[PDB]
Each structure stands twice: as C-alpha cells, then as structure tokens.
Curated annotation (Swiss-Prot):
Keywords: Electron transport, Heme, Iron, Metal-binding, Transport. GO terms for molecular function: electron transfer activity; heme binding; iron ion binding. Binds 1 heme c group covalently per subunit. It comes from the Bacteria. This is Cytochrome c'. Heme c binds at residues 10, 15, 68-69, 118, 121-122. One of its GO terms (biological process) is electron transport chain. It holds the Pfam family Cytochrom_C_2.
Length: 129
C-alpha cells in the first residue's frame, strides 16, 4: 500500500494501544473485573494486528519529516525492533489472562510489564522532540 496508508494504519494501531494503556491504567488503580475484561477484550483485538508490514523502509521520520516519529534506526535494527514488538504481544497476553482470571494483583503487575515494553521500544525507535 502507499506510504500514506501504512502511516495511517500504524498511527491508528498505536493510538488504539495508547487509549488501551490509558484505560487499563485507570482500571488497575481501581480494579473492577468486569471493566478489566472489557479492556482486555479490546486489547486482544488490537494485538491481532500484524505491524511488521507497517514499517517498510522509506517511512522514517527523515524520509517523511513531520509525518512520523519512526526513527531511521528501526531499519538498521529490524531484528531488535521485531523482538521488542514480540515482547509487547507476550506482555499483552499476560494482561489479558489476568483480566480474565479476575486477578487484580496480577493484572496490575502484568500491566507494569506491558507498559515497560512500550517504553523499551519507544526509547530506541520513536522520535522525542
Ligand atoms: C505499549 C502497549 C505501547 C503503547 C501504549 C504505545 C503507544 C504509542 C502511541 C500513543 C504512539 C503515537 C501514536 C500517534 O501518532 O498518536 C506510538 C508511536 C510509536 N510506537 Fe508505540 N506504543 C506501544 C508499544 C510500542 C512498541 C512495542 C514499539 C516498537 C516495537 C513501538 C513503536 C512505536 C513507533 C515506532 C511509533 C511511531 C509511529 C509513527 O509515528 O509512525 N511502540 N506508540
């Protein structure tokens, strides 16, 4: 697809994740198993997205100044970038299971683990200022 659509797709994917992280953070603060499962259901849908095809070479912030925050570095570290995405999917599965187990403590713990995967990747691959 055109750069405009992959950029569109990956932007929507990440916005959805951000909204999910935000909502689950609030649930973790005041655990309600029903709201957790609702959030987990949404996170599950989000994680079904194949994002590898969302980062084709030529879509870094240097190629498309201001259109994206993806750093050119991603393309010099695709194995690490994929690994970090993988870590997120795994952390996500744990958050989903904890929500479904109705386990508030595990949910909060898994959520910390998930947040960490977002940071681990952003630190090396997303544009700050
Ligand atoms: C962890 C679950 C996670 C969250 C939360 C998250 C959020 C997020 C947002 C809100 C954006 C900005 C979206 C927008 O344009 O409004 C964003 C952008 C990027 N992310 Fe991220 N992200 C999470 C996880 C990860 C992981 C696991 C990776 C790397 C393996 C990653 C990468 C990126 C990149 C690159 C961007 C820039 C996208 C762009 O501007 O085109 N994120 N993320």
């Amino acid at each position: 697809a055109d750069t405009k659509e992959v950029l569109e797709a990956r932007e929507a994917y990440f916005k959805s994740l951000g909204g999910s992280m935000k909502a689950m953070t609030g649930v973790a603060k005041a655990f309600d198993a029903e709201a957790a499962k609702v959030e987990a259901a949404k996170l599950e849908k989000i994680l079904a997205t194949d994002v590898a095809p969302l980062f084709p070479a030529g879509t870094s912030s240097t190629d498309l100044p201001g259109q994206t925050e993806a750093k050119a570095a991603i393309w010099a570290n695709m194995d690490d970038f994929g690994a970090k995405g993988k870590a997120m999917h795994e952390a996500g599965g744990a958050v989903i299971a904890a929500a479904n187990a109705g386990d508030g403590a595990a949910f909060g713990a898994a959520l910390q683990k998930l947040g960490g995967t977002c940071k681990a990747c952003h630190d090396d691959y997303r544009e700050e200022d």
